[PDB]
Design a protein around this nucleic acid. Sequence first.
RNA 1: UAAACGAUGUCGACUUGGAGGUUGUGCCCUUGAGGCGUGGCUUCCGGAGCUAACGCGUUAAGUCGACCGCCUGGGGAGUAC
Lengths: 70, 135, 128, 74
Amino acid sequence: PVIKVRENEPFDVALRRFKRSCEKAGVLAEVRRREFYEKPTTERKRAKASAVKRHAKKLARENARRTRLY
Amino acid sequence: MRHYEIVFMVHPDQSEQVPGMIERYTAAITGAEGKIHRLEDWGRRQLAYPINKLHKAHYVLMNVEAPQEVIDELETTFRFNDAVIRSMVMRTKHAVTEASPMVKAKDERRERRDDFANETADDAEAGDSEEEEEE
Amino acid sequence: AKAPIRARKRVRKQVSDGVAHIHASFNNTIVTITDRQGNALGWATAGGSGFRGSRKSTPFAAQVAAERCADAVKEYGIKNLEVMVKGPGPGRESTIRALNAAGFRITNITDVTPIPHNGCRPPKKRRV
Amino acid sequence: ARYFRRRKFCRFTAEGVQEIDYKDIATLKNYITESGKIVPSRITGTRAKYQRQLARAIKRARYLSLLPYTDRHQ
RNA sequence: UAAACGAUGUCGACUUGGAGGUUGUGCCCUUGAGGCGUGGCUUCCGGAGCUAACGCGUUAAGUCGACCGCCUGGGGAGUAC
């Protein structure tokens, strides 16, 4: 996961962020552990869970003003 | 009928076996009041990673519509053809059998980007121009 | 300074150019120089730098491995390099900087890290 | 003026590209990097249907060597 | 068989909704995975009401309806019989 995508102008330090778009994730991340078939369905699927923090954050900006912290 | 998009590829040196089998298969399709809505040969193309040896194979895209019965004798036959390395047959839902996305790239391949060699004369004897031995 | 020497004549494989392969684990690093069509011109390791243990798998141990191997292959007669990378292990950049310090250009830092189609079940490790 | 129905850039900001066809390589590459793998749906904000039929299609295609299956073949 | 479930039986009637994910589909620079029109699962949010408390709230843990399953201190016993 130095990533095959070539960094603009070649250098000895890979620009690993700017190279990667969806690599290592799922594919080379679960190293040396017993592989389950169906566990992801209940283990991993936390999209619903992260959607709550994004709403909450968009609510609180108006509310800090209404408290006059802002 | 239900629409079955069969595409398959063939090993060059064993290819001489398939030109007799495809023309019995197209006849089993139109013999049942299904249709061949194109029958496109693409010529020989490079595999990225080898399948059943050799880094090249020869491609035929059928664009079938056919009844379910007929497709049951055919799938078992193309899968157990030695000349064929692999085949894939695609779903009825939202399925095209006309206006090929790869029609230009097929012509380009056939006309100009082919091998142009004797082992691939064996492939042009397996496309739309099929010739096969007498039994 | 310059000396008045007889003609030089020896061969090993006189390659001028190569590929390298770096198989990076959690416990060690394997760095191996090859011919372009792909045949061994030498290797080194971070355990063959004689650090032992976990210490074989740090940037500073990846570095000196890369340098171990790069010295010897001058007798095989290599002058320019490309690298193939295979692993999640440590020494990501610091092994490349050392290949560059052997006087070679390293424009191609090519990942080939093989992802099987969900291969053999790995060791369970801990009982939780 | 009324009833345009899909001129351009209308319904959705990102287009659905193909569904279930797998014989063209460039229609597939709209969701496959040069590194050789399919993109998560979270990242594009694609809608789920066009992604589900494509998963199937990209594999049909992979098994016929119309694409590289694995990163070691770059 | 169990952690057979939002630890919550079934099916059905009734009780302010907004918005997301995403789909049938009327209408729209389909300019907004959006809006409005109307269904769909799925998910955030909270009112009337209910709770020991968390928590639920139109996918109830609300108002109810009929009929079923099942419980009545712990250990020893999910075994004995």
